[PDB]
Amino acid sequence: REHWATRLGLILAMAGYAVDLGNFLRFPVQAAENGGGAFMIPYIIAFLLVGIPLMWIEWAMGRYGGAQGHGTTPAIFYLLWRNRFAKILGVFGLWIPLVVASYYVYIESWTLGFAIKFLVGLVPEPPTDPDSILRPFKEFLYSYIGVPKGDEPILKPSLFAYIVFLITMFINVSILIRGISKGIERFAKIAMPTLFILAVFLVIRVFLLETPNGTAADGLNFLWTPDFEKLKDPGVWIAAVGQIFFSLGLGFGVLITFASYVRKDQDIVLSGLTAATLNEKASVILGGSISIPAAVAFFGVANAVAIAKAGAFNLGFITLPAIFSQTAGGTFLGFLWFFLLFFAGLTSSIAGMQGMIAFLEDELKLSRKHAVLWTAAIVFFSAHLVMFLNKSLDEMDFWATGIGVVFFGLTELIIFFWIFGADKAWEEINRGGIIKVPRIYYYVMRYITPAFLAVLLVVWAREYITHWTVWITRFYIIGLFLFLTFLVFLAERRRNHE
């Protein structure tokens, strides 16, 4: 079995997974709409009661299973719980990253595509007034995606967008086909420093922005000025808990797959706590200093509410390009911005397609070459539903990431800490650890964390409870689960023979 080469590489690869576009775009928006700086109170709390406990568990399960040649949840859940339902629930943690890859890599191609368009200068050049600056970029993005102009729910992506998507896929394969150490780790050692420099360079440049409508100080001011009256809202505490899940990448079965390449007695407690910290630092320091400020610096603090309500997607794909087109040398600023985003996602995409690669290698005994190409083949095919069927993306994202990861997360708790036994589990987390987990976390992991998850579930289960074309997507994603259930079946039939 393959292994991480260096402790640093492990943490960077982990951190490379956790730091995606969400750090720079989703996190700033959520904070501004939920009390600004006061949002740090439920966020930090959820980071201690939910994020940190759940991270150590997936790290534990991964390493536990990885010692026995199994990096995937179908196998691992059968080890923690010798049962048929365990292998079935384990399917989800092979299903979720595979559904996300069906659109994530695609969105990742956009950044690459835009970064190419920005570098060569193939960007709109307005013209005055905000709608007169945004619209040329609104139409610029829609032509790329192929956003439906008619009543038909049909996308028509440009030939360029598609070609970049092929390239993007090819880029992902190029890294993944070299393995864990010489591929993901070696790239994590390059991308993460590259990421940091690009972030810092923008943070510096954003702070130097000065328009008649305001400055970057006004942006950091609005974003961080605490509104404690919103802490009364349970929805904020739900958005916080949901965000920690989103930003740490919990419940995707990717931490489990990745930790399974950590050696049996190697530390997971401290190494994990570091990778988790790297992610959070990236968000609060770099992420909330680039997007929101530059948007407020240009449109004024008056539109700071309207900008935050415009969504995290408009901010990164319509707003921020529109602003760079108005700044000195901003064509290159656009290029850096998107080239920052590309690697942020490229370090995440490679990480989650490993789950399917690890499955074919461990359970179906495929070589690394085949396991990669067939995983690429699957992703590439399924992505066509996202590329062409309008709102297919959103539907996939709603199930896989909305409840898929939250449900599978709470499943991970009960299986490892309640079914497998808490004592046996606690030793599995702390074993080989440079530092030991605080004795108080035993109660957090056993009661507080599942309580938070179960009462995030109920809050999700009710209010979060569309055109007929969503069924096409439902049809497909259900079909995937059945397909994976079948491979698990074939996986256990191949083992009884040998």
Ligand SMILES: CNCC[C@@H](Oc1ccc(C(F)(F)F)cc1)c1ccccc1
């Ligand atoms: C690292 N923090 C999580 C953010 C990111 O996580 C993932 C991103 C991509 C993948 C995939 F590439 F599909 F494997 C798997 C997980 C994600 C989560 C939900 C939707 C889109 C992206």
Ligand code: NA
């Ligand atoms: Na993150």
Ligand code: NA
């Ligand atoms: Na990433």
